[PDB]
PDB file of C-alpha atoms in Angstrom:
ATOM      1  CA  UNK A  16       0.582 124.989  93.159  1.00 46.35           C
ATOM      2  CA  UNK A  17      -0.197 121.265  93.156  1.00 48.07           C
ATOM      3  CA  UNK A  18       2.528 120.097  90.759  1.00 50.33           C
ATOM      4  CA  UNK A  19       5.078 119.097  93.401  1.00 48.04           C
ATOM      5  CA  UNK A  20       2.327 117.378  95.405  1.00 49.44           C
ATOM      6  CA  UNK A  21       1.304 115.327  92.376  1.00 50.53           C
ATOM      7  CA  UNK A  22       4.931 114.346  91.868  1.00 50.63           C
ATOM      8  CA  UNK A  23       5.231 113.125  95.459  1.00 48.57           C
ATOM      9  CA  UNK A  24       1.992 111.121  95.058  1.00 49.45           C
ATOM     10  CA  UNK A  25       3.137 109.501  91.804  1.00 46.88           C
ATOM     11  CA  UNK A  26       2.959 105.715  92.200  1.00 47.42           C
ATOM     12  CA  UNK A  27       2.549 106.145  95.965  1.00 44.81           C
ATOM     13  CA  UNK A  28       0.850 103.760  98.360  1.00 42.24           C
ATOM     14  CA  UNK A  29      -1.768 105.049 100.788  1.00 39.33           C
ATOM     15  CA  UNK A  30      -2.869 103.798 104.203  1.00 40.42           C
ATOM     16  CA  UNK A  31      -5.653 105.028 106.453  1.00 39.27           C
ATOM     17  CA  UNK A  32      -4.497 105.676 110.029  1.00 37.51           C
ATOM     18  CA  UNK A  33      -7.221 105.799 112.686  1.00 36.98           C
ATOM     19  CA  UNK A  34      -6.203 107.360 115.994  1.00 37.05           C
ATOM     20  CA  UNK A  35      -8.321 106.995 119.118  1.00 35.55           C
ATOM     21  CA  UNK A  36      -7.548 110.554 120.280  1.00 36.48           C
ATOM     22  CA  UNK A  37      -6.436 113.958 119.045  1.00 30.46           C
ATOM     23  CA  UNK A  38      -3.444 114.123 121.401  1.00 29.40           C
ATOM     24  CA  UNK A  39      -1.402 111.503 119.566  1.00 27.94           C
ATOM     25  CA  UNK A  40      -2.093 113.188 116.225  1.00 24.57           C
ATOM     26  CA  UNK A  41      -0.968 116.507 117.722  1.00 28.68           C
ATOM     27  CA  UNK A  42       2.173 114.801 119.029  1.00 26.44           C
ATOM     28  CA  UNK A  43       2.786 113.226 115.607  1.00 28.57           C
ATOM     29  CA  UNK A  44       2.478 116.653 113.941  1.00 25.79           C
ATOM     30  CA  UNK A  45       4.916 118.227 116.414  1.00 23.65           C
ATOM     31  CA  UNK A  46       7.575 115.497 116.442  1.00 25.25           C
ATOM     32  CA  UNK A  47       7.261 113.876 113.000  1.00 27.04           C
ATOM     33  CA  UNK A  48       6.681 110.339 114.302  1.00 25.63           C
ATOM     34  CA  UNK A  49       3.965 107.716 114.337  1.00 28.09           C
ATOM     35  CA  UNK A  50       3.499 104.355 116.026  1.00 26.05           C
ATOM     36  CA  UNK A  51       0.904 101.685 115.297  1.00 22.99           C
ATOM     37  CA  UNK A  52      -0.042  98.165 116.409  1.00 21.31           C
ATOM     38  CA  UNK A  53       2.320  95.349 115.344  1.00 16.17           C
ATOM     39  CA  UNK A  54       0.018  94.012 112.601  1.00 14.20           C
ATOM     40  CA  UNK A  55       0.071  97.383 110.853  1.00 16.64           C
ATOM     41  CA  UNK A  56       3.726  98.076 111.629  1.00 17.09           C
ATOM     42  CA  UNK A  57       4.602  94.966 109.635  1.00 15.07           C
ATOM     43  CA  UNK A  58       2.476  96.106 106.679  1.00 16.85           C
ATOM     44  CA  UNK A  59       3.998  99.607 106.639  1.00 16.45           C
ATOM     45  CA  UNK A  60       7.565  98.299 106.813  1.00 15.69           C
ATOM     46  CA  UNK A  61       6.858  96.107 103.760  1.00 15.67           C
ATOM     47  CA  UNK A  62       5.241  99.009 101.925  1.00 18.18           C
ATOM     48  CA  UNK A  63       8.131 101.378 102.688  1.00 17.90           C
ATOM     49  CA  UNK A  64      10.549  99.188 100.721  1.00 20.88           C
ATOM     50  CA  UNK A  65       8.051  98.655  97.880  1.00 21.63           C
ATOM     51  CA  UNK A  66       7.070 102.180  96.841  1.00 22.18           C
ATOM     52  CA  UNK A  67       8.676 105.552  96.161  1.00 22.99           C
ATOM     53  CA  UNK A  68       6.256 107.132  98.666  1.00 23.66           C
ATOM     54  CA  UNK A  69       4.093 105.637 101.404  1.00 21.46           C
ATOM     55  CA  UNK A  70       1.396 108.097 102.507  1.00 19.70           C
ATOM     56  CA  UNK A  71      -0.436 107.914 105.849  1.00 21.15           C
ATOM     57  CA  UNK A  72      -3.832 109.649 105.894  1.00 22.47           C
ATOM     58  CA  UNK A  73      -4.909 110.388 109.463  1.00 23.31           C
ATOM     59  CA  UNK A  74      -8.378 110.415 110.991  1.00 24.82           C
ATOM     60  CA  UNK A  75      -9.226 110.790 114.679  1.00 25.62           C
ATOM     61  CA  UNK A  76     -12.042 108.465 115.704  1.00 25.70           C
ATOM     62  CA  UNK A  77     -15.400 110.279 116.075  1.00 23.31           C
ATOM     63  CA  UNK A  78     -14.033 113.530 114.629  1.00 25.08           C
ATOM     64  CA  UNK A  79     -15.825 113.227 111.280  1.00 23.52           C
ATOM     65  CA  UNK A  80     -12.680 114.471 109.549  1.00 21.08           C
ATOM     66  CA  UNK A  81      -9.230 113.628 108.310  1.00 19.08           C
ATOM     67  CA  UNK A  82      -6.497 115.610 110.090  1.00 17.96           C
ATOM     68  CA  UNK A  83      -3.840 115.610 107.372  1.00 17.88           C
ATOM     69  CA  UNK A  84      -1.409 113.307 105.624  1.00 18.54           C
ATOM     70  CA  UNK A  85       2.292 112.500 105.780  1.00 19.41           C
ATOM     71  CA  UNK A  86       4.958 110.468 103.997  1.00 18.39           C
ATOM     72  CA  UNK A  87       6.969 107.723 105.691  1.00 19.27           C
ATOM     73  CA  UNK A  88      10.637 108.692 105.780  1.00 19.17           C
ATOM     74  CA  UNK A  89      11.851 105.487 107.473  1.00 20.31           C
ATOM     75  CA  UNK A  90      10.982 101.989 108.571  1.00 19.75           C
ATOM     76  CA  UNK A  91      10.015 101.544 112.207  1.00 23.26           C
ATOM     77  CA  UNK A  92      12.797 101.777 114.791  1.00 23.76           C
ATOM     78  CA  UNK A  93      12.956 100.884 118.484  1.00 25.59           C
ATOM     79  CA  UNK A  94      14.716 102.505 121.428  1.00 31.22           C
ATOM     80  CA  UNK A  95      15.056 106.062 120.140  1.00 30.27           C
ATOM     81  CA  UNK A  96      12.902 107.944 122.665  1.00 28.65           C
ATOM     82  CA  UNK A  97       9.893 107.257 124.915  1.00 30.05           C
ATOM     83  CA  UNK A  98       7.084 108.944 122.981  1.00 25.55           C
ATOM     84  CA  UNK A  99       4.459 110.056 125.511  1.00 25.83           C
ATOM     85  CA  UNK A 100       1.479 108.695 123.612  1.00 26.47           C
ATOM     86  CA  UNK A 101      -1.891 108.801 125.360  1.00 27.83           C
ATOM     87  CA  UNK A 102      -2.847 105.194 125.674  1.00 27.63           C
ATOM     88  CA  UNK A 103      -6.459 104.066 125.131  1.00 27.70           C
ATOM     89  CA  UNK A 104      -8.169 101.314 127.112  1.00 27.67           C
ATOM     90  CA  UNK A 105      -6.403  98.010 126.486  1.00 26.64           C
ATOM     91  CA  UNK A 106      -3.465  99.729 124.766  1.00 28.77           C
ATOM     92  CA  UNK A 107       0.060  99.575 126.179  1.00 29.36           C
ATOM     93  CA  UNK A 108       3.407 101.234 125.514  1.00 29.92           C
ATOM     94  CA  UNK A 109       4.997  97.953 124.397  1.00 32.08           C
ATOM     95  CA  UNK A 110       2.531  97.624 121.509  1.00 35.48           C
ATOM     96  CA  UNK A 111       3.097 101.220 120.353  1.00 34.19           C
ATOM     97  CA  UNK A 112       6.806 100.453 120.337  1.00 37.46           C
ATOM     98  CA  UNK A 113       8.314 100.855 116.916  1.00 36.33           C
ATOM     99  CA  UNK A 114       8.526 104.462 115.760  1.00 35.17           C
ATOM    100  CA  UNK A 115       8.292 105.584 112.142  1.00 35.30           C
ATOM    101  CA  UNK A 116       9.647 108.957 111.077  1.00 36.50           C
ATOM    102  CA  UNK A 117       7.200 110.895 108.882  1.00 35.04           C
ATOM    103  CA  UNK A 118       7.302 114.158 106.921  1.00 34.06           C
ATOM    104  CA  UNK A 119       3.983 115.972 106.911  1.00 38.86           C
ATOM    105  CA  UNK A 120       2.633 116.953 103.527  1.00 34.30           C
ATOM    106  CA  UNK A 121      -0.570 118.579 104.833  1.00 30.38           C
ATOM    107  CA  UNK A 122      -1.503 119.391 108.434  1.00 34.12           C
ATOM    108  CA  UNK A 123      -4.952 120.774 107.499  1.00 36.47           C
ATOM    109  CA  UNK A 124      -8.312 119.080 108.140  1.00 34.76           C
ATOM    110  CA  UNK A 125     -10.718 117.674 105.566  1.00 32.82           C
ATOM    111  CA  UNK A 126     -14.310 116.845 106.603  1.00 32.77           C
ATOM    112  CA  UNK A 127     -15.676 113.448 105.554  1.00 34.31           C
ATOM    113  CA  UNK A 128     -18.531 115.245 103.794  1.00 32.15           C
ATOM    114  CA  UNK A 129     -16.004 116.420 101.183  1.00 33.23           C
ATOM    115  CA  UNK A 130     -14.811 112.878 100.344  1.00 32.46           C
ATOM    116  CA  UNK A 131     -18.249 111.265  99.978  1.00 34.78           C
ATOM    117  CA  UNK A 132     -17.699 110.797  96.215  1.00 34.09           C
ATOM    118  CA  UNK A 133     -14.541 108.650  96.683  1.00 38.24           C
ATOM    119  CA  UNK A 134     -14.792 104.885  97.229  1.00 39.01           C
ATOM    120  CA  UNK A 135     -11.933 102.491  97.989  1.00 41.61           C
ATOM    121  CA  UNK A 136     -11.682  99.353  95.801  1.00 39.71           C
ATOM    122  CA  UNK A 137      -9.663  97.625  98.533  1.00 41.12           C
ATOM    123  CA  UNK A 138     -12.532  98.026 101.038  1.00 43.00           C
ATOM    124  CA  UNK A 139     -15.459  96.799  98.918  1.00 46.19           C
ATOM    125  CA  UNK A 140     -15.900 100.292  97.350  1.00 46.64           C
ATOM    126  CA  UNK A 141     -17.106 101.702 100.637  1.00 47.06           C
ATOM    127  CA  UNK A 142     -16.568 105.458 101.097  1.00 41.67           C
ATOM    128  CA  UNK A 143     -12.886 106.084 101.713  1.00 43.54           C
ATOM    129  CA  UNK A 144     -13.644 107.451 105.190  1.00 43.52           C
ATOM    130  CA  UNK A 145     -14.670 103.897 106.157  1.00 44.51           C
ATOM    131  CA  UNK A 146     -11.958 101.480 107.175  1.00 46.78           C
ATOM    132  CA  UNK A 147      -9.948 100.056 110.026  1.00 43.53           C
ATOM    133  CA  UNK A 148      -6.600 101.436 111.151  1.00 43.85           C
ATOM    134  CA  UNK A 149      -4.083 100.411 108.489  1.00 42.67           C
ATOM    135  CA  UNK A 150      -6.545  99.901 105.629  1.00 40.76           C
ATOM    136  CA  UNK A 151      -4.792 100.335 102.287  1.00 42.53           C
ATOM    137  CA  UNK A 152      -6.367 102.834  99.877  1.00 43.34           C
ATOM    138  CA  UNK A 153      -6.003 102.118  96.159  1.00 40.63           C
ATOM    139  CA  UNK A 154      -3.775 104.539  94.176  1.00 38.04           C
ATOM    140  CA  UNK A 155      -6.416 106.524  92.275  1.00 36.76           C
ATOM    141  CA  UNK A 156      -8.733 106.967  95.271  1.00 38.87           C
ATOM    142  CA  UNK A 157      -5.850 107.882  97.571  1.00 35.50           C
ATOM    143  CA  UNK A 158      -4.458 110.399  95.085  1.00 35.86           C
ATOM    144  CA  UNK A 159      -7.820 112.108  94.664  1.00 35.24           C
ATOM    145  CA  UNK A 160      -8.355 112.132  98.446  1.00 37.13           C
ATOM    146  CA  UNK A 161      -5.008 113.840  99.062  1.00 32.93           C
ATOM    147  CA  UNK A 162      -5.745 116.397  96.350  1.00 31.93           C
ATOM    148  CA  UNK A 163      -9.000 117.363  98.139  1.00 32.25           C
ATOM    149  CA  UNK A 164      -7.184 118.703 101.194  1.00 28.96           C
ATOM    150  CA  UNK A 165      -6.706 122.465 101.437  1.00 33.50           C
ATOM    151  CA  UNK A 166      -3.175 123.442 100.434  1.00 31.65           C
ATOM    152  CA  UNK A 167      -0.774 123.679 103.386  1.00 33.76           C
ATOM    153  CA  UNK A 168       1.294 126.704 102.394  1.00 33.55           C
ATOM    154  CA  UNK A 169       3.513 126.255 105.474  1.00 31.64           C
ATOM    155  CA  UNK A 170       5.120 123.133 103.928  1.00 31.53           C
ATOM    156  CA  UNK A 171       7.790 123.125 101.208  1.00 27.65           C
ATOM    157  CA  UNK A 172       7.751 119.829  99.297  1.00 30.64           C
ATOM    158  CA  UNK A 173      11.269 120.435  97.942  1.00 28.07           C
ATOM    159  CA  UNK A 174      12.924 118.562 100.823  1.00 26.75           C
ATOM    160  CA  UNK A 175      10.367 115.720 100.594  1.00 29.03           C
ATOM    161  CA  UNK A 176      11.203 115.215  96.914  1.00 28.02           C
ATOM    162  CA  UNK A 177      14.900 114.916  97.806  1.00 28.70           C
ATOM    163  CA  UNK A 178      14.178 112.061 100.240  1.00 30.53           C
ATOM    164  CA  UNK A 179      12.760 110.141  97.273  1.00 32.38           C
TER     165      UNK A 179
END
């Protein structure tokens, strides 16, 4: 059912994460971690203290899809492990320093064609698929977007609820 999901999303904050490649999203799904540029790391650390749940909604650039969504379980932390991210042009390992722990809520894909009816008030009411890495998605739009994903029956939200 969707009842536990709706409970997790209650009063949550939502941020769009844009990854340049699939490999880092695969690594994030396997290890339960994410790293972003310092401007967005600062925003997510602030949000983590401000809300019961902070939800990251992932999209790989050029894929035409979202790849899933996850809840922050911690603020960013340094010096825990050297995550072997694949670094784009101009990107360095010192910028992707700062690791957040995340619990995946859905590891399934959602094509952008399925979210064409959802617009984000915090990005000029453009379609929610449009936005830069770290763009905040308003509550109602973000909730409806997360509810569009196929259910991920491999995940038990019971342990997520206990982190809250």
